[PDB]
C-alpha cells in the first residue's frame, strides 16, 4: 500500500492540501507577518473579540485532527529545502494556533473573573474548555512529530533541528509573556502586541506593580503545558550552548548561527529571567491556594511540578554554567524584587511545613537554587542584604533578634555568614562586623528576656540548630572578639543578679540557656569540637530529625510527660558531648581571662552563688498547677548551675 | 611524610580497600597537588605507580573530595598522555584504560600489572627521604567542612543504592 | 564514528551521507583489488 502511495507522488499532494486550508490560512499569514516584523501578534483582543474568535472552535478541532492524521502518514522523507520550509511553516502555524486558543481561553477566564456571576456551570462552556484542551494538545503533538521527523532525517540535520527548536521556544516564550501580562480589569476594560507593551512599560517611570494583588488571575492548565514545553526547549538550547556581540540569530530554518546567537536572540525578544521568576511565583501561589482550598485544574501537583521544574532549570542551566556571557547576563539581570519574591516563597514554604511528596521535591529544588545562588558569587552584597532584610534576620536590624529561625532561613543565613567569615579569614580582614553585631543583638535580646522573666512558646525562642551555628560563628573569631564576648557575658551575669527578689518568683528558662552557653564557652574557649562541625554540616548545610546532645535525664521526664513517642521539638538540649562527663577540664585561656582586668571575679562568684535560688518561690498558694514545662525548666536550670559551680575555682 | 601517605595502598595491596583508608588517601592527593605535577626524572616512576594504584583503588568503589581527587588524577594522566617521558612507570595504553576506568565501572586493569606496580612501588626511592620503600581527625573534618561549605554538590540534577552512587560518580 | 556523526546536533544527514560514500568507495576499491589478484602471473612478475 505504501509502495502504491508514494508511487503516485501523494506526499506532495497531501502536503499541498494541508497547507492551503481555509481556516489555518489566517494563522499562517499571522505567523508570517510576525516573523517578518520580528514582533509577536496575538489577537483575542477584548472579551467580545475573544467570544468572536470562539464559537468557531469545532472547525479548528476538525482541522487539527485531519492535519495530524495526514502528518502521521509516511509522506515526509524527501526533505528538500522547499519541502523543509513548507513543513516548518505548517508546524509553526499550528503551534501559533494552539498559542492563540490558549490566550483566548485565558482572556475569557479573566473576563469571567471580572464579573461575579453565580450561574451554574453550563454544558457549552465545558465543551469549549474541552475543545481548547484538545486543540492545544493536538498542536503540541504535531509540533513534536514534525521536530522528530526533522531531527532523524537524512537530508536535514542538527542545524535545522536547532533552528526549529529556537523558533518554537521563541513563540512559546512570547505567548507566555503575553498571557502573564494580562491585566485583571484595567487594560482589559480600557481595551474596549509585545513591542507596544514593552514601549509602554519602559515609558512609565514605575513598572507595572504585579505584587501581592489579585492581578494574576489568569494562568491555568494550558499555561502550565505551554510553560513545560518552553522549558524543555530552553534546557535543550542551553545544554547545547554549554559545550563578539553579533546580530541575533535569524528566524529561518535555513539560518546558520551559533548557540550564543540563538540565546541572545531569545533574550532580545523577551527579558527571560523576570518572566521565569514570574511564572515560578504564580505557579507556586496557585498551587498553595488550591491546596488551602482543598482542605487536572482541580489538583495542585501539576503547578507545583512546573514550579520545581522551572527552578531546577534556573539552577542547572544558568547558575552552574561555565560560559562567561551567560554569567554576565545573570549578574546584570538579577533584581531586588526577585529577592523579595524569593523571600516570600521561603516564608510560605517554612510556615506551611512538610505536606507531601511533591512538597518534598519542591523543597529540595528551592534549597538547591537558594544555595547555588548564594555560593556562586553573582549576587551583589546589597542583594544579599536585601534578601536578609526581607527574611527579617538582617544582621544590622535594630529590633530584637528573632530567637527562632525556620530551617530554610537558618540554612541560607548560616551559609552567607560562614562564607563571609571564611573569605575574611582567608584574606586577612579583621573580624566581620556582621557577626559581632549579630552576637551583640542575640545577647541583648537574651538579657531582656531574662530580665522580664518570660517563658517563650515552643516555636518562639532558640531552637538547637540556631545555637549551634552561633557557636560555630563564635569559634571563627579572633582572640580579641572572643575575650570581648566573654567579658560582655560576665557583665550580663553580674548585672542580672542584682534583682534577686524579683528572680525568686520567675521561671529560669532563659537563664538556663545563658548558663549553658557560658559553660560551653568555659569548656571550649580556644578550640572547636569535631561534633560541632558534623552537626552544623548535617542539620544546616546538608540537602533536605536534627542531631544534638540533649540532657538524657531532663529529656526522660519531658518524653514521659509527652507520652506518645513523638518528641518533635527538642526544648531541653545540651551542646557539649556526654563524653566530657568524666572529671571537665577547665580551659587555661578561659581562666587566664577570668583572673585579669576587665572582669571582676569576686562579685562574679558571688552572683553565681546567689543565683542558686532563682526559682525557690515559684511553687508558692493560688492552687494553680505546676506544668511539666516549668518543673523541667527548674530541674534543667539547677543541674546546669550545679555543674558550672563545680568547675570554677573558689 | 609521604611514607605514611603511601601506607594504605601498600596495606591494601594484599586485600581489598578498607573504607577507613579512603578519606586520608583523598586528603593526601589534594594536599600534594602543588607537588604531583612538577618533578624531576628520578621520582617520576614512583609517582606513576602511586597514582596507578590510587586510581585503581578509588574506581573499585564525601563525594566532593572524591571528585576533586579524581579530577586531580585525570589531569595528571592527561598531561602524561601529552608529553609522555621515557621513564614513566605506566605506559600510555595503561593511562588510556585507567582514564576509561575512572569514567566507567573499573574493568580495565589486571592483577598481573598491579603486582609489577607494587614491586616498583617498593623498589622506588621516596621524595623526602633517600630511603626506598623496600589532631588529624579534627583537621580532616575541617577540610571536609570547608569543601562542603564552599561549593554545592548537585545532587539530584543528574537523576538501587550502588547504581545511583555509581552514576553520580561517573557524572562528576 | 559513523553513529557519532549521524546522531550529533552539529553534523547532520549530509555529512553522514558523505561519510558513507567515502567508506563505500574505500571498501569497493579494496574488494576490486583483492579480487583482481593473479595466482602466479602478476604476483611473480611483480618481483
Render B108-124 in DSSP notation, one character per residue: S--HHHHHHHHHHHHHS
Number of helices (H), then strands (E), in chain C: 3, 0
Query: Helices in A8-46 by DSSP H: which ranges?
Result: 10-19, 24-37
Instruction: Please name the residues in contact with A522: beta carbons below 8 A apart, sequence gap of 6 or more.
Output: A586, A587, A590, A644, A647, A648
B125 DSSP β-pair partners: B132
- Interface touch A372/B155, C-beta < 8 Å: no
Q: Which residues make Cβ contacts (< 8 Å) with residue B71, sequence separation at least 6?
A: none
Compute CA distances A561 → A279, A508, B170, whole Å. 48, 20, 51
> Among partner residues B142, B145, B157, which is closest to A315 by beta-carbon distance?
B157
Question: Does an H or E element contain A427, and which?
Answer: helix A407-427
Query: Crossing angle of helices A123-151/A221-242, nearest 10°?
Result: 20
Residues of chain A contacting C11 with CB distance shorter than 8 Å:
157-158
C-alpha cell at A384: 544579599
Q: Is B142 an interface residue toward A (CB < 8 Å)?
A: yes
Nearest of A508, A515, A512, A510 to residue A614 by alpha carbon: A508
First to last CA, chain C: 39
User: A594 is written with which cell numbers?
Assistant: 577570668
Query: Hey, is the C-beta of A86 within 8 angstroms of any chain C C-beta?
Result: no
At A191, is the secondary structure helix, strand, or coil? Answer: coil
The whole-angstrom distance between A313's CA and the closest CA on chain C is 21
Q: What is the Cα–Cα distance from A138 to A68, expressed in whole angstroms?
A: 7
Is residue A199 within 8 Å of A141, Cβ to Cβ? no
Tell me how far apart the alpha carbons of residues A442 and A518 are, in angstroms, rounded to a whole number: 14
- Residue A643: helix, strand or coil by DSSP? helix
Check CB contact under 8 Å for B149 and A422.
Answer: yes
Residue among A415, A533, A543 minimizing CB distance to B145: A533
Cα–Cα distances (Å) from A530 to A572, B40, B62, in that order, read 22, 39, 16
Q: What b/e sequence results for C5-38 when a residue is b if at least 16 CB atoms lie within 10 Å of its CB, and e otherwise?
A: bbeebebbbeebeeeeeeeeeeeeeeeeeeeeee
Asked if A265 and A170 touch (Cβ cutoff 8 Å), the reply is: yes
State whether A155 and C13 contact (CB < 8 Å). yes
Closest CA to A178 of A317, A76, A275: A275
User: Under a CB-based contact definition with an 8 Å cutoff, are residues B86 and B41 in contact?
Assistant: no
In this structure, are residues A518 and A464 in contact, taking their beta carbons and an 8 Å threshold?
no
Distances (CA, A) of A486 to A345, A482, A489: 38, 6, 5
How was it solved?
A: cryo-EM
Q: What is the resolution of this structure in A?
A: 3.1
In contact, A261 and A286? CB cutoff 8 Å = no
CB-closest option in C9, C15, C17 to A161: C9
Are A632 and A560 in contact by the 8 Å Cβ rule? The answer is: no
CA–CA dist A342, A348 (Å, integer)? 10
User: What is the residue-wise DSSP string for A479-543?
Assistant: HHHHHHHHHHHHHHHHHHTS-HHHHTTS--SHHHHHHHHHHHHHHSSS---HHHHHHHIIIIIS-
Q: Residue A561: which H helix or E strand, with range? A: helix A552-562
For residue A572, give the 3-state DSSP assignment: coil
Using DSSP's 3-state secondary structure scheme, residue B125 falls into strand
Residue-wise over A151-189: b if at least 16 C-beta within 10 A, else e?
Answer: bebebbbbbbbbbbbbbbbbbbbbbbbbbbbbebeeebe
Beta bridge partners of B132: B125
The secondary structure of residue A208, as a DSSP letter, is: P
> Rounded to whole angstroms, how far apart are CA atoms B140 and B138?
6
Q: Which of A167, A162, A217, A213 is nearest to A188 (CA)?
A: A217
Cα gap A518→A516, rounded to integer Å: 5
Exposed e or buried b for every residue in B125-135, given b needs 16+ CB within 10 A?
A: eebeeeeebee
Residue where the block lists cell 569514567: B103
Residues of A with CB under 8 A from a CB of B: 312, 315-316, 364, 368, 371-372, 375, 415, 418-419, 422, 527, 530, 533-534, 536-537, 541, 543
CB A310, CB A283: distance < 8 Å? yes
CA distance B52 to B98: 8
What is the spatial distance between Cα C37 and Cα C43, in angstroms, rounded to a whole number? 8
A275: helix, strand or coil: helix
Residue with cell 586531580: B72
For chain B, first and last CA: distance in Å?
A: 30
From the candidates C3, C6, C12, which should be mutated to test the interface with A, based on the most A CB atoms within 10 A?
A: C12
A160 CB near a chain C CB, below 8 Å?
A: yes
Identify whether the C-beta of residue A348 lies closer than 8 Å to the C-beta of residue A389: no
**Which residue, B141, B172, B140, B138, is CA-closest to B155?**
B172
| Element holding C4 (H helix, E strand) | helix C2-6
Q: Any idea what the Cα angle at residue B148 is, between residues B143 and B154, rounded to 5°?
A: 150
A426: Cβ–Cβ under 8 A, 6 or more apart, which residues?
A: none
Please check whether residue A339 is in contact with residue A258, taking contact to mean a CB–CB distance below 8 angstroms.
no
- Report the distance separating Cα A87 and Cα A93, nearest Å: 10
Q: Which residue, chain included where needed, has cell 564552599?
A: B150
Q: Which three cell numbers stand for residue A44?
A: 483575542
Which residue, A222, A218, A217, A257, is CA-closest to A241?
A: A257
**Which residue(s) pair with A487 in the sheet?**
none
| C-alpha to C-alpha distances, A576 to A413, A640, B53, nearest whole angstrom | 23, 12, 41
CB B21 within 8 A of CB B60: no
Question: CA A404, A406, A408, A413: dihedral to nearest 10 degrees?
Answer: -20
Contacts of A189 (CB under 8 A, 6+ apart): A114
Determine whether the interchain pair A159/C12 forms a contact, defined as Cβ–Cβ distance below 8 Å.
yes
Instruction: Say which residues have a Cβ less than 8 Å from residue A399's Cβ, sequence separation at least 6.
Output: none
Query: Which ranges of A270-397 does DSSP label H, i.e. alpha helix?
Result: 272-294, 301-313, 324-333, 336-352, 357-375, 381-391
Distance CA A176, CA A102 (A): 10
What the block records as the C-alpha cell of A274 is 523576570
How far is the alpha carbon of B157 from chain A, nearest alpha carbon, in Å?
A: 7
Q: What is the phi/psi pair of residue B132, to 5°?
A: -80, 165
Q: How many CB atoms lie within 10 A of CB A270?
A: 17
Among B148, B156, B157, the residue with its CB nearest the CB of A537 is B148
Question: Which residues in A lie closer than 8 A to residue B138 (C-beta atoms)?
Answer: 527, 530
Task: Tell me the shortest Cα–Cα distance from B73 to chain A, in angstroms.
Answer: 22
**Alpha carbons A238 and A313: distance in angstroms, whole number:** 10
Phi, psi values for residue B125, rounded to 5°: -85, 145
Hey, are the CB atoms on C10 and A159 less than 8 Å from each other? yes
- Report chain A residues whose CB lies below 8 A from the CB of B148: 537, 541
Shortest distance between the Cα of A6 and any Cα of chain C, in A, equals 22
What does the alpha-carbon distance between residue A148 and residue A154 come to, in Å, rounded to a whole number?
12
Cα of C14 to nearest chain A Cα, Å: 6
- B145 shares contact with chain A (CB less than 8 Å): yes
What Cα–Cα distance (Å) separates residue B43 from each residue in A68, A587, B37, B86, B133? 70, 46, 11, 13, 12
Q: From the CA of C2, how many Å to the nearest CA of chain A?
A: 13
CA distances from B123 to A354, B46, B120, B130, B134 (A): 60, 9, 5, 12, 6
Amino acid at each position: 500500500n505504501v509502495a502504491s502511495l508514494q508511487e503516485l507522488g501523494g506526499s506532495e499532494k497531501l502536503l499541498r492540501v494541508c497547507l492551503n486550508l481555509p481556516y489555518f490560512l489566517r494563522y499562517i499569514n499571522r505567523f508570517q507577518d510576525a516573523v517578518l516584523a520580528n514582533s509577536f501578534f496575538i489577537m483575542p483582543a477584548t472579551v467580545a473579540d475573544a467570544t468572536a474568535v470562539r464559537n468557531g472552535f469545532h472547525s479548528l478541532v476538525i482541522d487539527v485532527t485531519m492535519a495530524l492524521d495526514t502528518l502521521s502518514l509516511p509522506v515526509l522523507e524527501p526533505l528538500n529545502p522547499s519541502r523543509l520550509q513548507d513543513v516548518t511553516v505548517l508546524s509553526l502555524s499550528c503551534l501559533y494556533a494552539g498559542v492563540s486558543v490558549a490566550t483566548c481561553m485565558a482572556i475569557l477566564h479573566v473576563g469571567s473573573a471580572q464579573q461575579v456571576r453565580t450561574g451554574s456551570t453550563s454544558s457549552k462552556e465545558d465543551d469549549y474548555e474541552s475543545d481548547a484542551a484538545t486543540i492545544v494538545q493536538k498542536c503540541l503533538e504535531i509540533y513534536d512529530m514534525i521536530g522528530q521527523a526533522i531531527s532523524s532525517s537524512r537530508r536535514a540535520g542538527g542545524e535545522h533541528y536547532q533552528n526549529f527548536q529556537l523558533l518554537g521556544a521563541w513563540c512559546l516564550l512570547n505567548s507566555l509573556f503575553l498571557i502573564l501580562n494580562l491585566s485583571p480589569t484595567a487594560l482589559a476594560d480600557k481595551g474596549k502586541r509585545v513591542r507596544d507593551i514593552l514601549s509602554r512599560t519602559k515609558e512609565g517611570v514605575g513598572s507595572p506593580k504585579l505584587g501581592p494583588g489579585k492581578g494574576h488571575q489568569g494562568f491555568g492548565v494550558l499555561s502550565v503545558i505551554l510553560a513545560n514545553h518552553a522549558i524543555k526547549l530552553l534546557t535543550s538550547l542551553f545544554q547545547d550552548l554549554q559545550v563578539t556581540d553579533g546580530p541575533p540569530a535569524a528566524l529561518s530554518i535555513m539560518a546558520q548561527s551559533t548557540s550564543i546567537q540563538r540565546i541572545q536572540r531569545l533574550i532580545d525578544s523577551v527579558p527571560l529571567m523576570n518572566l521565569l521568576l514570574t511564572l515560578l511565583s504564580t505557579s507556586y501561589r496557585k498551587a498553595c491556594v488550591l491546596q488551602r482550598q482543598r482542605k487536572s485544574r482541580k489538583d495542585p501537583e501539576l503547578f507545583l511540578g512546573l514550579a520545581s521544574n522551572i527552578l531546577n532549570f534556573i539552577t542547572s542551566s544558568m547558575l552552574n554554567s561555565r560560559n562567561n556571557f551567560i554569567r554576565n547576563y545573570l549578574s546584570v539581570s538579577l533584581s531586588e524584587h526577585h529577592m523579595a519574591t524569593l523571600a516570600s516563597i521561603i516564608k510560605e514554604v517554612d510556615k506551611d511545613g512538610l505536606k507531601g511528596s511533591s512538597d518534598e521535591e519542591f523543597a529540595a529544588a528551592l534549597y538547591h537554587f537558594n544555595h547555588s545562588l548564594v555560593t556562586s558569587d553573582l549576587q551583589s552584597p546589597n542583594l544579599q542584604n536585601t534578601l536578609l532584610q526581607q527574611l527579617g534576620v538582617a544582621p544590622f536590624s535594630e529590633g530584637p533578634w528573632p530567637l527562632y529561625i525556620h530551617p530554610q532561613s537558618l540554612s541560607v543565613l548560616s551559609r552567607l555568614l560562614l562564607i563571609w567569615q571564611h573569605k575574611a579569614s582567608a584574606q586577612g580582614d579583621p573580624d566581620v562586623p556582621e557577626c559581632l553585631k549579630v552576637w551583640d543583638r542575640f545577647l541583648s535580646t537574651m538579657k531582656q528576656n531574662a530580665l522580664q522573666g518570660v517563658v517563650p512558646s515552643e516555636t518562639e525562642d532558640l531552637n538547637v540548630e540556631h545555637l549551634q551555628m552561633l557557636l560555630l560563628i563564635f569559634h571563627n573569631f579572633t582572640e580579641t572578639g572572643r575575650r570581648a564576648i566573654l567579658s560582655l557575658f560576665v557583665q550580663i551575669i553580674q548585672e542580672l543578679s542584682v534583682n534577686m527578689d524579683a528572680q525568686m518568683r520567675f521561671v529560669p528558662l532563659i537563664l538556663a540557656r545563658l548558663l549553658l552557653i557560658f559553660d560551653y564557652l568555659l569548656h571550649q574557649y580556644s578550640k572547636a569540637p569535631v561534633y560541632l562541625f558534623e552537626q552544623v554540616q548535617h542539620n544546616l548545610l546538608s540537602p533536605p530529625t536534627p542531631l544534638y546532645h540533649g540532657f538524657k535525664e531532663v529529656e526522660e521526664n519531658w518524653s514521659k510527660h509527652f507520652s506518645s513517642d513523638a518528641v518533635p521539638h527538642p526544648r531541653f538540649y545540651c551542646v557539649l558531648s556526654p563524653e566530657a562527663s568524666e572529671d571537665n577540664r577547665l580551659d587555661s585561656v578561659a581562666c587566664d581571662v577570668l583572673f585579669s582586668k576587665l572582669v571582676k571575679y569576686d562579685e562574679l562568684y558571688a552572683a553565681l552563688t546567689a543565683l542558686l535560688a532563682a526559682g525557690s518561690q515559684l511553687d508558692t498558694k493560688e492552687n494553680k498547677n505546676v506544668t511539666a514545662l516549668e518543673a523541667c525548666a527548674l530541674q534543667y536550670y539547677f543541674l546546669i548551675l550545679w555543674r558550672i559551680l563545680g568547675i570554677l575555682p573558689p | 611524610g609521604w611514607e605514611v601517605a603511601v601506607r594504605p595502598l601498600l596495606s591494601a595491596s594484599y586485600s581489598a580497600f578498607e573504607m577507613k583508608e579512603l578519606p586520608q588517601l583523598v586528603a593526601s592527593v589534594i594536599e600534594s597537588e602543588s607537588e604531583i605535577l612538577h618533578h624531576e626524572k628520578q621520582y617520576e616512576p614512583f609517582y606513576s605507580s602511586f597514582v596507578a594504584l590510587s586510581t585503581h583503588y578509588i574506581t573499585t568503589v564525601q563525594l566532593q573530595s572524591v571528585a576533586a581527587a579524581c579530577k586531580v588524577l585525570i589531569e595528571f594522566s592527561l598531561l602524561r598522555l601529552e608529553n609522555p617521558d621515557e621513564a614513566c612507570a605506566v605506559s600510555q595504553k595503561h593511562l588510556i584504560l585507567l582514564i576509561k576506568g575512572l569514567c566507567t565501572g573499573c574493568s580495565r586493569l589486571d592483577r598481573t600489572e598491579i603486582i609489577t606496580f607494587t614491586a616498583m612501588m617498593k623498589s622506588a626511592k621516596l621524595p623526602q627521604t633517600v630511603k626506598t620503600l623496600s589532631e588529624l581527625r579534627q583537621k580532616e573534618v575541617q577540610m571536609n567542612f570547608l569543601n562542603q561549605l564552599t561549593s554545592v554538590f548537585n545532587p539530584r540534577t543528574v537523576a538501587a543504592s550502588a547504581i545511583k552512587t555509581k552514576n553520580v560518580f561517573i557524572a562528576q
